[PDB]
Amino acid sequence: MAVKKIAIFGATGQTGLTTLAQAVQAGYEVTVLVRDSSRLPSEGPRPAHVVVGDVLQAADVDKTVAGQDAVIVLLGTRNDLSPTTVMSEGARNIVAAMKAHGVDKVVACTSAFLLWDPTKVPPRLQAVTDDHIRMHKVLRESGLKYVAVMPPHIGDQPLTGAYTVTLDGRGPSRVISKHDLGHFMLRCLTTDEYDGHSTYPSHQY
Ligand SMILES: NC(=O)c1ccc[n+]([C@@H]2O[C@H](COP(=O)([O-])OP(=O)(O)OC[C@H]3O[C@@H](n4cnc5c(N)ncnc54)[C@H](OP(=O)(O)O)[C@@H]3O)[C@@H](O)[C@H]2O)c1
């Protein structure tokens, strides 16, 4: 039986916006949690349901996850590189809401640094990476069906749907377009082949 209803967390971010647009265009019934609805567009495809709130508030997350078939996580810290627990605490809330509502599939973005040599993270990105690691741990230990998406640099190239997905962080490039990353998150809703795996999408544009 196929996924029809999804929640997207981080839908207003760079990857989230295009994932949201793609998901709605593809026929999903999409719910988003946003702190600030002005960051959603008017033009283009529109989510079916908007919850205004914060991933750090369990009740807001619970309302967003209720009734879904799957969850996509595209949380991040925008240009804030300071020490942080937002993503991992958000993930804890997401896991608890999934378990409370019977939702068993989550596709969540961290970064290719979690596949590459862990001693080879630029210093300025280490604090954010440490919270990606905490988030990955929360999701992997949840025992839910979890696809770990670990992209390299997120670019602005057009959608292709032609990227390569490896399991080890090696591949044709160190870039994935935001649009292709979103397309891949959606693909993960219609296969089990990546459940319990780490995935590395990349493409030469
Ligand atoms: N940039 C890169 O090249 C790169 C490479 C690999 C991995 N990544 C990782 O990939 C992920 C996606 O990156 P991105 O650039 O698409 O994301 P982004 O533009 O940073 O967007 C972050 C999203 O998270 C939401 N968010 C943050 N705090 C929240 C909170 N307390 N409650 C609810 N929502 C919250 C933001 O909401 P608002 O719109 O309200 O701010 C926004 O929708 C990030 O974890 C990033 O670190 C990035």
Output the CA 1–ligand 1 centroid distance in Å: 30
CB of 125 within 6 A of ligand 1: the answer is no
Q: Counting atoms of ligand 1 from 1, which one is nearest the CA of 12?
A: 43
Chain centre distance of CA 124? 22
User: Ligand 1, closest atom to CA 10?
Assistant: 43
Structural domain spans, the chain = 1-205
d(CA 193, CA 120): 29
Sign (positive/negative) of CA torsion 109, 113, 114, 116? positive
Residue to substitute in 8, 9, 12 for testing ligand 1 pocket (most ligand atoms within 8 angstroms of CB): 12
- For the chain, the three-class secondary structure string (H helix, E strand, C coil) is CCCCEEEEECCCCHHHHHHHHHHHHHCCEEEEEECCHHHCCCCCCCCCEEEECCCCCHHHHHHHHCCCCEEEECCCCCCCCCCCCHHHHHHHHHHHHHHHHCCCEEEEECCHHHCCCCCCCCHHHHHHHHHHHHHHHHHHHCCCEEEEECCCEEECCCCCCCCEEECCCCCCCCEEEHHHHHHHHHHHHHCCCCCCCEEEEECCC
Resolution of this entry in Å? 1.1
Dist. CA 22–CA 65, nearest whole Å = 20
Cβ–Cβ under 8 Å, residues 97 and 52: no
Half-sphere exposure of 44 (CA within 13 A, CB side): 13
To the query of whether residue 109 is one of the catalytic residues in this protein, the response is yes
Q: How far is the CA of 194 from the centre of ligand 1 (A)?
A: 22
CA-CA distance, 154 to 176, in Å (whole number)?
A: 5
Residue linked to tokens 């490039």: 173
Q: How far apart are CA 75 and CA 40, in angstroms?
A: 15
Q: Is 79 in the pocket of ligand 1 (CB under 6 A)?
A: no
CATH of domain 1-205: 3.40.50.720
Contacts of 107 (CB under 8 A, 6+ apart): 70, 71, 72, 73, 146, 147, 149, 185, 188, 189
The whole-angstrom separation of Cα 150 and Cα 153 is: 10
Q: How far is CA 134 from CA 25, 34, 53, 178, 204, in A?
A: 33, 22, 22, 23, 30
> Smallest Cα–Cα separation from 74: which of 138, 7, 133?
7
188 carries an active-site annotation:
yes
The whole-angstrom separation of Cα 192 and Cα 22 is 20
Other CB atoms within 10 Å distance of the CB of residue 175: 19
Q: Which of 109, 112, 181, 185 is catalytic?
A: 109
Q: In whole angstroms, give the CA distance from residue 103 to residue 7.
A: 10
Q: How many CB atoms lie within 10 A of CB 152?
A: 21
How far is residue 195 CA from its own chain's centroid? Answer: 14
The size of the chain, in residues, is 205
Binding residues for NADP(+), as ranges, are: 10, 12-15, 35, 38-39, 54-55, 75-76, 78, 87, 109, 132, 153-154
Task: Determine the distance separating the centroid of ligand 1 and the alpha carbon of 16, expressed in angstroms.
Answer: 8
Q: Are 169 and 116 in contact (CB under 8 A)?
A: yes
- Residue 4's DSSP bridge partners are none
